[PDB]
């Protein structure tokens, strides 16, 4: 119940917290000694483009793009928690929830409600759009894994990331895209 | 399928993660942001900076697409001294190459988004151009703060003098310059 107001100063401060996403490297790459790992905002950027180009006539894509730009936003405060950090699901949720409250309080009421709603939709996976964006997250991530493998000239190195997405995919377009990716990568591995 | 081309499109887009923003590099910024970092916050700005006269989702899309050619041509800075037509020519070729990897409806949609920004042919594109400049001077003051070197990136602010007229962005920029100036006066 803070007293920072909802003027330009608070909007600016909201924007600074958001910019901290540029300086949160994605932890999974850090823990695997990737040189120059992407930021969390790098990751959401490509998810957002993927929402634009991976087709599904049943989905509101404007909402999918917004879910993509908002879903990881709490990491500007809580940091990027990876499976290796062993934070229980409930504790990660509680931290990120508190963070989103703090962040959105800087915005006028209608904007606060809208952003928080989007975050809540994603976190509870309550819509088809939310579930779609969750698979973009996982897809975009193994794509980036294979790109770090290519850049390193170390085919297969980041195998653990592929294994962790086993059976997490069921959207027919993303499923198709993943299968193509795994086939191209598993070919490169055999070549080497 | 489809899929191989889509993947190639995605890998090109991914290169944006590895294009440092050139203006920061030229000013010895440590670990400078990528072009995708820059577009990310611009897209968030389109969501939270008010204007009921604008199609915000179109602004968000313009934000995510406007600098996309840079995955091929790189980030050209003013210091690079590339003529406006030449940069336009290069980015246009790049967008054609990029978008042709997509199905026809998406290829046309995406190219037209980029062209609308490029030609500044809508109220939305003009708005997004001011987010770009605003996002950038905010980022300059952030680098100044992180470096503990206030005012060091003044050239960037000087470069934006008189480029703002959108009422909300103007308020935001005034607020930023007053906070920054106060910090500089203090130090
Ligand atoms: Cl994520
Ligand atoms: Cl830009």
Curated annotation (Swiss-Prot), chain B:
UniProt family annotation: Belongs to the HDDC2 family.
Protein known as: 5'-deoxynucleotidase HDDC2
Subunit details: Homodimer.
Catalytic activity: a 2'-deoxyribonucleoside 5'-phosphate + H2O = a 2'-deoxyribonucleoside + phosphate
Keyword Acetylation set for record: yes
GO molecular function: 5'-deoxynucleotidase activity; metal ion binding
PANTHER family: 5'-DEOXYNUCLEOTIDASE HDDC2
UniProt entry keywords in alphabetical sequence: Acetylation, Cobalt, Hydrolase, Magnesium, Manganese, Metal-binding, Phosphoprotein
Record's cofactor remark: Binds 2 divalent metal cations. Shows activity with Mn(2+), Co(2+) and Mg(2+) but shows no activity with Zn(2+).
Binding residues annotated for a divalent metal cation 2, in chain numbering: 70, 75-76
Top EC class of this enzyme: hydrolase
Domain of life from the UniProt record: Eukaryota
The enzyme's E.C. designation: 3.1.3.89
Gene that encodes the chain: HDDC2
Cofactor requirements of the protein: Mn(2+); Co(2+); Mg(2+)
Purpose: Catalyzes the dephosphorylation of the nucleoside 5'-monophosphates deoxyadenosine monophosphate (dAMP), deoxycytidine monophosphate (dCMP), deoxyguanosine monophosphate (dGMP) and deoxythymidine monophosphate (dTMP).
Pfam families attached to this UniProt entry: HD_3 (PF13023)
Binding site residues for a divalent metal cation 1: 38, 66-67, 132
Positions of the HD domain: 35-137
């Amino acid at each position: 119940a803070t007293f920072s107001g909802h003027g330009a100063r608070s909007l600016l401060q909201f924007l600074r917290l958001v910019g901290q996403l540029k300086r949160v490297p994605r932890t999974g790459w850090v823990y695997r000694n990737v040189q120059r790992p992407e930021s969390v905002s790098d990751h959401m950027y490509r998810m957002a483009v993927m929402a634009m180009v991976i087709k599904d006539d049943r989905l509101n894509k404007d909402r999918c793009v917004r879910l993509a730009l908002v879903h990881a936003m709490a990491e500007c405060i809580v940091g990027d928690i990876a499976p290796a950090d062993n934070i229980p699901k409930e504790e990660k949720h509680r931290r990120e929830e508190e963070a989103m409250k703090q962040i959105t309080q800087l915005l006028p009421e209608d904007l606060r409600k809208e952003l928080y709603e989007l975050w809540e939709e994603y976190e509870t996976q309550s819509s088809a759009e939310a579930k779609f964006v969750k698979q973009l997250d996982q897809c975009e991530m193994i794509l980036q894994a294979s790109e770090y493998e290519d850049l390193e000239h170390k085919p297969g190195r980041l195998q653990d990331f592929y294994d962790s997405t086993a059976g997490k995919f069921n959207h027919p377009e993303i499923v198709q895209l993943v299968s193509e990716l795994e086939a191209e990568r598993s070919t490169n591995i055999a070549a080497a």
